[PDB]
Coordinates of C-alpha atoms and ligand atoms in Angstrom, one line a residue:
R1 CA 79.4 89.0 93.3
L2 CA 79.6 92.1 91.1
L3 CA 80.9 90.5 87.9
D4 CA 78.5 88.3 86.1
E5 CA 81.4 86.3 84.7
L6 CA 85.2 86.4 85.1
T7 CA 86.0 87.7 81.6
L8 CA 86.7 90.9 79.8
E9 CA 83.1 90.8 78.7
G10 CA 81.9 90.6 82.3
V11 CA 84.1 93.5 83.2
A12 CA 82.7 95.5 80.3
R13 CA 79.1 94.8 81.4
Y14 CA 80.0 95.9 84.9
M15 CA 81.6 99.1 83.7
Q16 CA 78.4 100.1 82.0
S17 CA 76.2 99.3 85.0
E18 CA 75.1 101.9 87.5
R19 CA 77.4 100.2 90.1
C20 CA 80.7 101.2 88.4
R21 CA 81.3 104.9 89.0
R22 CA 84.9 105.2 90.2
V23 CA 87.8 103.5 88.4
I24 CA 91.4 103.4 89.7
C25 CA 94.1 102.6 87.2
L26 CA 97.4 101.1 88.4
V27 CA 99.8 101.3 85.5
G28 CA 103.5 100.4 85.1
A29 CA 106.3 100.2 82.5
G30 CA 104.2 97.9 80.3
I31 CA 102.0 100.7 79.2
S32 CA 104.9 102.7 77.8
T33 CA 107.0 99.9 76.2
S34 CA 105.0 100.4 72.9
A35 CA 106.1 104.1 73.1
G36 CA 109.7 102.8 73.0
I37 CA 110.5 103.4 76.7
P38 CA 112.2 100.4 78.3
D39 CA 111.6 99.0 81.8
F40 CA 114.8 99.6 83.8
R41 CA 113.3 97.5 86.7
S42 CA 112.9 94.4 84.5
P43 CA 115.0 91.4 85.4
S44 CA 116.2 91.4 81.7
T45 CA 117.0 95.1 81.5
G46 CA 120.3 95.9 79.7
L47 CA 120.7 98.9 82.0
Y48 CA 123.7 97.6 84.0
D49 CA 125.6 96.4 81.0
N50 CA 125.1 100.0 79.7
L51 CA 126.2 101.4 83.0
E52 CA 129.6 99.8 82.9
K53 CA 131.1 102.8 81.1
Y54 CA 130.2 105.2 84.0
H55 CA 132.6 103.3 86.3
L56 CA 130.2 103.3 89.2
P57 CA 131.2 101.8 92.5
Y58 CA 128.3 99.4 91.9
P59 CA 125.4 99.6 89.4
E60 CA 122.6 100.4 91.9
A61 CA 124.5 103.6 92.7
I62 CA 122.9 105.2 89.7
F63 CA 119.6 105.1 91.7
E64 CA 120.9 106.3 95.0
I65 CA 120.3 109.9 96.3
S66 CA 123.6 110.0 98.2
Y67 CA 125.7 109.0 95.2
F68 CA 123.8 111.4 93.0
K69 CA 124.5 114.3 95.3
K70 CA 128.2 113.6 95.4
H71 CA 128.6 112.4 91.7
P72 CA 125.6 113.6 89.6
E73 CA 127.4 113.3 86.2
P74 CA 126.6 109.6 85.6
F75 CA 122.9 110.2 86.3
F76 CA 122.7 113.1 83.8
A77 CA 124.7 111.3 81.2
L78 CA 122.4 108.3 81.5
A79 CA 119.4 110.7 81.3
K80 CA 120.7 111.9 78.0
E81 CA 121.2 108.3 76.7
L82 CA 117.7 107.3 77.8
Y83 CA 115.8 110.5 77.0
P84 CA 112.6 109.5 75.0
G85 CA 112.9 110.1 71.3
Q86 CA 109.2 111.1 71.1
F87 CA 106.6 112.0 73.7
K88 CA 103.7 110.0 72.1
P89 CA 101.3 108.4 74.6
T90 CA 100.1 105.0 73.7
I91 CA 96.6 103.6 73.0
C92 CA 96.5 102.6 76.6
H93 CA 97.3 106.2 77.8
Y94 CA 94.5 107.6 75.6
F95 CA 92.1 104.9 76.9
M96 CA 92.7 106.4 80.3
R97 CA 92.0 109.8 78.9
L98 CA 88.6 108.5 77.7
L99 CA 88.0 107.2 81.3
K100 CA 88.7 110.8 82.5
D101 CA 86.5 112.3 79.8
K102 CA 83.6 110.1 80.7
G103 CA 83.8 110.9 84.4
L104 CA 84.9 107.4 85.4
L105 CA 88.6 108.0 86.4
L106 CA 89.0 108.4 90.2
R107 CA 92.8 108.2 90.0
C108 CA 95.7 106.9 87.9
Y109 CA 98.6 105.5 90.1
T110 CA 101.7 105.1 87.9
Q111 CA 105.1 103.6 88.3
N112 CA 106.3 105.6 85.2
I113 CA 108.5 108.7 85.2
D114 CA 108.0 109.5 81.5
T115 CA 105.2 112.1 81.8
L116 CA 103.1 110.4 79.1
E117 CA 100.0 110.4 81.3
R118 CA 100.2 114.2 81.5
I119 CA 100.8 114.5 77.7
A120 CA 97.6 112.4 77.2
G121 CA 95.7 114.9 79.3
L122 CA 95.5 113.5 82.8
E123 CA 95.9 116.4 85.2
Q124 CA 98.0 116.7 88.4
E125 CA 95.3 115.7 90.8
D126 CA 94.3 112.7 88.6
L127 CA 97.8 111.2 89.0
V128 CA 99.7 109.6 91.8
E129 CA 103.3 109.1 90.6
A130 CA 104.6 106.3 92.8
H131 CA 108.2 106.8 91.7
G132 CA 108.0 110.5 90.9
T133 CA 108.4 112.2 87.5
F134 CA 110.6 114.1 85.2
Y135 CA 107.8 116.6 84.7
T136 CA 109.3 119.0 87.2
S137 CA 112.7 119.3 88.9
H138 CA 113.8 121.2 92.0
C139 CA 116.9 122.7 93.4
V140 CA 118.1 120.4 96.2
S141 CA 118.9 123.1 98.7
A142 CA 116.4 123.1 101.5
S143 CA 116.3 126.9 101.8
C144 CA 115.7 127.4 98.1
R145 CA 113.9 124.5 96.3
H146 CA 113.4 126.5 93.1
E147 CA 111.2 124.6 90.6
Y148 CA 112.2 124.1 87.0
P149 CA 110.1 122.7 84.1
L150 CA 111.1 119.8 81.9
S151 CA 112.1 122.1 79.0
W152 CA 114.8 123.6 81.2
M153 CA 116.0 120.2 82.4
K154 CA 116.0 118.8 78.9
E155 CA 118.2 121.7 77.7
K156 CA 120.7 121.0 80.5
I157 CA 120.6 117.3 79.8
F158 CA 121.3 117.5 76.1
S159 CA 123.9 120.2 76.4
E160 CA 125.7 118.0 79.0
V161 CA 125.8 120.9 81.5
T162 CA 125.1 119.6 85.0
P163 CA 122.0 121.5 86.0
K164 CA 122.6 124.1 88.7
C165 CA 120.1 126.4 90.3
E166 CA 120.0 129.9 88.9
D167 CA 119.4 131.3 92.3
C168 CA 121.8 129.5 94.5
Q169 CA 123.9 127.2 92.3
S170 CA 123.0 124.0 94.1
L171 CA 122.2 120.9 92.1
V172 CA 118.8 120.7 90.4
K173 CA 117.3 117.2 90.6
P174 CA 114.3 115.8 88.6
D175 CA 111.4 115.0 90.8
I176 CA 111.9 111.2 90.5
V177 CA 112.2 109.2 93.7
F178 CA 115.8 108.0 94.2
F179 CA 116.7 105.2 96.5
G180 CA 117.1 106.8 99.9
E181 CA 114.3 109.3 99.3
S182 CA 110.8 109.0 100.8
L183 CA 107.5 108.8 99.0
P184 CA 105.7 112.1 99.2
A185 CA 102.9 112.3 101.8
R186 CA 100.5 112.7 98.9
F187 CA 100.9 109.1 97.9
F188 CA 99.7 107.8 101.3
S189 CA 97.0 110.5 101.6
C190 CA 95.5 109.5 98.2
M191 CA 95.8 105.7 98.9
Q192 CA 94.0 106.0 102.2
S193 CA 91.1 107.9 100.6
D194 CA 90.9 106.4 97.1
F195 CA 90.7 102.8 98.0
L196 CA 87.5 103.3 100.1
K197 CA 85.8 104.7 97.0
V198 CA 87.0 102.4 94.2
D199 CA 84.5 100.4 92.2
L200 CA 87.0 98.9 89.7
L201 CA 90.7 98.4 89.7
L202 CA 92.4 98.4 86.2
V203 CA 95.9 97.0 86.6
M204 CA 97.9 97.5 83.4
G205 CA 101.5 96.9 82.5
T206 CA 102.8 96.1 85.9
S207 CA 104.0 92.9 87.6
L208 CA 103.2 94.4 91.1
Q209 CA 106.6 93.3 92.4
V210 CA 108.1 96.6 93.4
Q211 CA 106.9 98.7 96.4
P212 CA 104.8 100.7 96.7
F213 CA 102.7 99.1 94.0
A214 CA 103.2 95.7 95.6
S215 CA 101.1 96.9 98.6
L216 CA 98.1 98.4 96.6
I217 CA 95.7 95.7 95.4
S218 CA 95.2 94.5 99.0
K219 CA 93.8 97.9 99.8
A220 CA 90.7 97.5 97.6
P221 CA 87.4 96.4 99.2
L222 CA 86.8 92.7 99.0
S223 CA 83.9 93.2 96.4
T224 CA 85.8 95.4 94.0
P225 CA 86.5 93.8 90.6
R226 CA 90.2 93.8 89.5
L227 CA 91.1 93.4 85.9
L228 CA 94.8 92.8 84.9
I229 CA 95.8 93.7 81.4
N230 CA 99.4 92.5 81.0
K231 CA 101.7 90.3 78.9
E232 CA 101.7 87.8 81.8
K233 CA 99.7 87.0 84.9
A234 CA 100.7 89.0 88.0
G235 CA 99.7 89.8 91.5
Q236 CA 99.0 86.3 92.8
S237 CA 100.4 85.8 96.3
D238 CA 103.7 83.9 96.3
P239 CA 103.2 80.2 97.4
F240 CA 105.2 80.8 100.5
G241 CA 96.3 89.1 102.1
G242 CA 94.3 90.2 99.1
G243 CA 96.4 88.7 96.3
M244 CA 94.9 88.1 92.8
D245 CA 92.8 85.0 92.5
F246 CA 92.1 84.4 88.8
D247 CA 91.9 80.6 88.6
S248 CA 91.0 79.0 91.9
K249 CA 87.6 77.4 92.4
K250 CA 86.9 80.4 94.8
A251 CA 87.7 83.0 92.2
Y252 CA 85.0 85.7 92.1
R253 CA 86.3 89.1 91.1
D254 CA 89.8 89.0 89.4
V255 CA 90.2 88.7 85.6
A256 CA 93.4 88.4 83.7
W257 CA 93.6 89.5 80.0
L258 CA 97.0 88.4 78.6
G259 CA 98.6 90.5 75.9
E260 CA 100.0 93.9 75.1
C261 CA 98.3 96.7 77.0
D262 CA 97.4 98.5 73.8
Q263 CA 95.6 95.4 72.5
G264 CA 93.8 94.8 75.8
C265 CA 92.6 98.4 76.0
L266 CA 91.5 98.4 72.4
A267 CA 89.5 95.2 73.1
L268 CA 87.9 96.6 76.2
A269 CA 87.1 99.9 74.4
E270 CA 85.5 97.8 71.6
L271 CA 83.2 96.0 74.1
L272 CA 82.3 99.4 75.6
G273 CA 81.3 100.9 72.2
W274 CA 84.3 103.3 72.4
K275 CA 86.5 101.8 69.7
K276 CA 85.7 104.6 67.1
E277 CA 86.2 107.3 69.8
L278 CA 89.6 105.8 70.8
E279 CA 90.8 105.2 67.3
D280 CA 89.9 108.8 66.2
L281 CA 91.5 110.3 69.3
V282 CA 94.7 108.3 69.0
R283 CA 95.1 108.9 65.2
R284 CA 94.6 112.7 65.7
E285 CA 96.9 113.0 68.6
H286 CA 99.6 110.8 67.1
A287 CA 99.5 112.7 63.8
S288 CA 99.9 116.0 65.7
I289 CA 102.8 114.7 67.8
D290 CA 104.6 113.3 64.7
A291 CA 104.3 116.8 63.3
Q292 CA 106.3 118.2 66.3
Ligands
LIG301 C1 110.8 112.6 80.5 C2 111.9 111.5 80.6 C3 113.2 111.9 80.7 C4 114.1 110.8 80.8 C5 115.6 111.1 80.9 N1 113.8 109.5 80.8 C6 112.4 109.3 80.8 S1 111.9 107.7 80.8 C7 113.4 106.8 80.4 C8 114.4 106.4 81.5 O1 114.4 105.3 82.0 N2 115.1 107.5 82.0 C9 115.9 107.5 83.1 N3 116.6 108.6 83.4 C10 117.3 108.3 84.6 C11 117.2 107.1 85.1 C12 117.8 106.6 86.4 C13 117.0 106.8 87.7 C14 117.6 107.3 88.8 C15 116.9 107.5 90.0 C16 115.5 107.3 90.0 C17 114.9 106.9 88.8 O2 113.5 106.7 88.7 C18 112.7 106.6 89.9 C19 112.8 105.2 90.4 C20 113.6 104.7 91.3 N4 113.2 103.4 91.5 C21 113.7 102.3 92.4 C22 114.1 101.1 91.7 C23 113.4 99.9 91.9 C24 113.7 98.7 91.2 C25 114.8 98.7 90.3 O3 115.3 97.7 89.6 C26 116.7 97.8 89.2 C27 116.8 96.9 88.0 N5 117.2 95.5 88.4 C28 116.0 94.8 89.1 C29 116.4 93.4 89.4 O4 117.8 93.1 89.0 C30 117.9 93.3 87.6 C31 117.6 94.7 87.2 C32 115.4 99.9 90.1 C33 115.1 101.1 90.7 N6 112.2 103.1 90.6 N7 111.9 104.2 90.0 C34 115.6 106.7 87.7 S2 116.1 106.1 84.2 N8 111.5 110.3 80.7
ZN302 ZN1 118.4 127.0 94.5

């Protein structure tokens, strides 16, 4: 097996061997909760309680493309309510920036729409946004599709003006994937290529319960180590394949580190000799963002 032991220490030794060249990060809402962004897919989300005042036909309508296109106002009111107070990536985000800097990051697949990976410096081709992103928006008319930056969309959101295209006056929609919309072809193109190449899967802040993330860890080669950094264990197959095997007698490649993603990334960085680099980077970038 590739790991000499099923611990964070074994993963760190593997990462600094010649065998570990290409790391894929799979990240979810748990890497942004310390940035103050709540997980609306969580079983305990307060979202639906807070949706009551929009008198929706049913709560899930907030996520549905057909409802959006006929009644966009609840979505844009909610977007104002939930707009992040700061755009300050976490220790975990900057750990991924170090992976990029050091030439180890093949790809970051993210469930998050908050753009924090981009603020931390991951570039477009580094990222696969499994549920889309607020980073860009597009006019919804097929013959127009004018693109708008987040600054434009933010101004419309905060002024409570439903965003309309300047060229054709159709609705302008953030590039997040509503229910009823398809994943872009790029998700499948990347998945089909990346998981032939991956030497290490870093799974952070995701329960792997929602598609398409629920399909991803089975795509890795059988030998590829998989490290979960999460408040709780996740990814084991339901008792009723390629699911996580942390604890059986046959476990050989999967490691669970249980805690906040920031703490787990700090601990891994420390084992790698990167703790000073990560602390200096985060303190500098956070001070600068607090200044904005
Ligand atoms: C830069 C920036 C700016 C803003 C404004 N915000 C943020 S970030 C802050 C945040 O949230 N802003 C939001 N703005 C709008 C929101 C609503 C919304 C509508 C449509 C798509 C959305 O996104 C993509 C998406 C869609 N799906 C599918 C899905 C899957 C599982 C789900 O479970 C429902 C919850 N149930 C689960 C079990 O039963 C109990 C609870 C729900 C949806 N997944 N992703 C988002 S959310 N950043
Ligand atoms: Zn247009």
